[PDB]
Design a binder for this molecule. Structure first.
Ligand SMILES: CCCN(c1nc(-c2nc(N)cc(N)n2)cs1)c1cc(-c2ccc(S(=O)(=O)N3CCN(C)CC3)nc2)ccc1C
Ligand SMILES: CCCN(c1nc(-c2nc(N)cc(N)n2)cs1)c1cc(-c2ccc(S(=O)(=O)N3CCN(C)CC3)nc2)ccc1C
Ligand SMILES: O=c1ccn([C@@H]2O[C@H](COP(=O)(O)OP(=O)(O)O)[C@@H](O)[C@H]2O)c(=O)[nH]1
Ligand SMILES: O=c1ccn([C@@H]2O[C@H](COP(=O)(O)OP(=O)(O)O)[C@@H](O)[C@H]2O)c(=O)[nH]1
Ligand code: NA
Ligand code: NA
Lengths: 230, 230
């Protein structure tokens, strides 16, 4: 019938890609939209652009943050809309799991870059104006959020496990800042956003500090119970 | 009934703002969408952002070209859509004159900045991808184009008449480059674009080298004849 839209949120290396790849296999009624930035980490024009932008970002974040954030968010909206229009047309209970959302783009990542002076006030105000508009010009509004909650230390350890050379420099302090933002948005619900409906969207919080790759049935049971409430 | 969309195109200081302000007064069925960049040259968030971006552009175009071009084009689409949805609902023969278009944004200005190395290949490819997408996600497609054709020398003289301090440094060579692009697009129709319908859109070319402020009736007669053909 109508596709349920669920975003999977969480810190760097919390296990979102891992969890989403588990979910996709469990039901023909379940599909996933992987995060464009994750895929930037035969190549399409977007992958070539995104690999160049990520590389330049590691080199000079105060030059590239606005360009990166705008392209990442555009790429996400395009990919989410393509799945929403493309998939699950013959499903009985269709669910589309988004790996992160246009809200994590703005309120986690772009916000953090502005706070670190990697965007100036004009870049940040243009970005928010563009986001406010790019989102209204609607069908991507979330039915629920699944928060994969891990400690900064767990996420630092999982960056090490994943082994991308570019990321081994990421310090615990950066992960603690992103952790606080997620806790403010999704646990305390203190974060004010420009999207009124978000204060009321249901949120399922899953503790993923314990390795779940071979032992995920309890997490999936909580996902199925949560889905039945929507 | 259905609003006719006509873009007014031409080099810097050819007399577009002048012509559009003449047209708006002549018919209750005629409305105009002034160019956001022109208005950046009580202040809204967009005017504050746009004044800052223009100022930084004069200082360092190779840092600010991508940010400026994206914001100018967004601002234009927003303003054109607002007029298309807002105005001329009780008109018998409604016409909306756009001061320039999303096509002059990309194929005149952004293209020129890429050619001058003020955008690198990644910035230019991201911009074109964004434009290709930002335009499809449709109701702004043009019914006709009015080309206000002036020599670079006329336009250089009219920059002097207009007297904006920031512009007095603009050299003839820059105006000659923008002139060639307009002639390729609108006179020879040699310019290849990613918008197939544009090769076939009617174009009215008006020679505006002679001052028309007190003597514009022949130009308006050619506009009314052109409109009757659409
Ligand atoms: C794996 C993280 C990749 N990463 C980023 N990703 C995103 C992102 N944005 C989305 N919209 C979606 C999405 N999925 N991802 C935004 S930025 C990234 C981060 C840093 C970076 C390094 C170091 C510190 S810091 O805290 O040590 N510090 C340094 C000194 N000074 C400036 C203050 C801050 N901060 C950020 C540099 C490059 C990059 C690509
Ligand atoms: C009145 C023109 C304002 N102007 C511009 N406007 C637009 C624009 N874009 C739209 N999408 C819509 C729209 N309405 N306008 C784009 S750029 C602008 C132009 C220059 C500038 C100066 C000098 C030379 S140059 O040829 O002398 N040369 C210098 C050495 N080196 C780099 C090679 C080039 N080129 C550009 C610098 C700032 C600015 C704001
Ligand atoms: O229960 C888990 C969850 C994740 N990982 C590993 O932790 C790293 C990061 O996970 P992922 O890529 O899923 O994190 P994301 O950034 O997508 O949240 C990867 O090497 C995973 O194989 C793990 O070993 N056990
Ligand atoms: O027939 C004309 C057309 C224009 N102008 C002057 O030329 C300058 C630039 O015109 P406009 O602002 O209309 O140019 P645009 O950049 O909008 O094409 C202004 O000072 C106008 O008053 C003029 O004196 N006579
Ligand atoms: Na599936
Ligand atoms: Na009018």
């Amino acid at each position: 019938t109508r596709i349920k839209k669920i975003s999977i949120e969480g810190n760097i290396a919390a296990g979102k890609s891992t969890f989403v790849n588990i979910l996709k296999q469990l039901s023909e009624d379940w599909e996933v939209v992987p995060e464009p930035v994750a895929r930037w980490s035969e190549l399409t024009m977007e992958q070539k652009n995104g690999g160049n932008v990520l590389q330049m970002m590691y080199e000079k974040p105060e030059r590239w943050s606005f360009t990166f954030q705008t392209y990442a968010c555009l790429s996400r909206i395009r990919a989410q809309l393509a799945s929403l229009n493309g998939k699950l047309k013959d499903a009985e209970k269709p669910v589309l799991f988004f790996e992160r959302s246009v809200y994590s783009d703005r309120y986690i990542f772009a916000s953090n870059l502005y706070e670190s002076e990697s965007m100036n006030e004009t870049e940040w105000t243009i970005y928010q104006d563009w986001h406010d508009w790019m989102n209204n010009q609607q069908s991507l509004e979330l039915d629920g959020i699944i928060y994969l909650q891990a400690t900064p230390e767990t996420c630092l350890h999982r960056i090490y496990l994943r082994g991308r050379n570019e990321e081994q420099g990421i310090p615990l302090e950066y992960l603690e800042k992103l952790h606080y933002k997620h806790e403010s948005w999704l646990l305390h619900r203190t974060l004010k956003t420009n999207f009124d409906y978000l204060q009321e969207v249901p949120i399922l919080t899953l503790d993923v500090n314990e390795d779940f790759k071979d032992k995920y049935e309890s997490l999936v049971e909580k996902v199925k119970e949560f889905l039945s409430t929507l």
